[PDB]
Scaffold this active site. Structure first.
Site, mmCIF file in Angstrom:
data_model
loop_
_atom_site.group_PDB
_atom_site.id
_atom_site.type_symbol
_atom_site.label_atom_id
_atom_site.label_comp_id
_atom_site.label_asym_id
_atom_site.label_seq_id
_atom_site.Cartn_x
_atom_site.Cartn_y
_atom_site.Cartn_z
ATOM 1 N N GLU A 1 39.180 39.057 37.695
ATOM 2 C CA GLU A 1 38.540 40.333 37.394
ATOM 3 C C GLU A 1 37.113 40.182 36.865
ATOM 4 O O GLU A 1 36.399 41.160 36.749
ATOM 5 C CB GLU A 1 39.300 41.069 36.279
ATOM 6 C CG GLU A 1 40.747 41.432 36.577
ATOM 7 C CD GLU A 1 40.732 42.518 37.592
ATOM 8 O OE1 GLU A 1 39.740 43.180 37.803
ATOM 9 O OE2 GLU A 1 41.852 42.688 38.206
ATOM 10 N N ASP B 1 34.372 49.610 39.832
ATOM 11 C CA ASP B 1 35.220 48.598 40.420
ATOM 12 C C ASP B 1 35.105 48.638 41.915
ATOM 13 O O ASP B 1 34.368 49.448 42.487
ATOM 14 C CB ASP B 1 36.659 48.662 39.945
ATOM 15 C CG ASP B 1 37.432 49.843 40.489
ATOM 16 O OD1 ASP B 1 36.905 50.677 41.186
ATOM 17 O OD2 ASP B 1 38.688 49.929 40.091
#
Ligand SMILES: Cc1cccc(Cl)c1N
Ligand SMILES: [Cl-]
Ligand SMILES: [Cl-]
Length: 162
Positions: A11, A20
């Site tokens: 991540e 994102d």
């Protein structure tokens, strides 16, 4: 290697609000703040999670706190799910990390819909499960990361994380 390092690899770490891969506001170590497109909604959510007026920026310790809570919640989510629990408990330790990773990225929901894969993983049909897992929007949208997780399920080792 452990779940933390694995997810921190998948991540990354960012201290300022960001979008994102799906275009949603997120922060820290993959912590989703909101699916809404109002940055302000995102900032409000951030202050609420952190407990202070952040103005869209946090510290590493703060990010790390969020990450801890999020790993925890994911596991717990797994354990509380009746379709998930049984599969999870049938796996070895490495593969359990691959399951937590998927849940962390997609929600208990998103996962709960991989029924056929879950069954395969439960029967320990590694190569079969790996092919089935790839037939998904998840692999098509984030293929490099999906590849890593699938290898992990396939092999039971940390090789893809090198
Ligand atoms: C997301 C998830 C939760 C529990 C068990 C498995 Cl195999 C998976 N993939
Ligand atoms: Cl929080
Ligand atoms: Cl990717």
């Amino acid at each position: 290697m452990n779940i933390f390092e694995m997810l921190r690899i998948d991540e990354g770490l960012r201290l300022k609000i960001y979008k994102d891969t799906e275009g949603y506001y997120t922060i820290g170590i993959g912590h989703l703040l909101t699916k809404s497109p109002s940055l302000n909604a995102a900032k409000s959510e951030l202050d609420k999670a952190i407990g202070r007026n952040c103005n869209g920026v946090i510290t590493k310790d703060e990010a790390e706190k969020l990450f801890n809570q999020d790993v925890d919640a994911a596991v717990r989510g797994i354990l509380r799910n009746a379709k998930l629990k049984p599969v999870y408990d049938s796996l070895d330790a490495v593969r359990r990390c691959a399951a937590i990773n998927q849940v962390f990225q997609m929600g208990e929901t998103g996962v709960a819909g991989f029924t056929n894969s879950l069954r395969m993983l439960q029967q320990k049909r590694w190569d079969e499960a790996a092919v089935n897992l790839a037939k998904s929007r998840w692999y098509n949208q984030t293929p490099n990361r999906a590849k890593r997780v699938i290898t992990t399920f396939r092999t039971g080792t940390w090789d893809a994380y090198k």
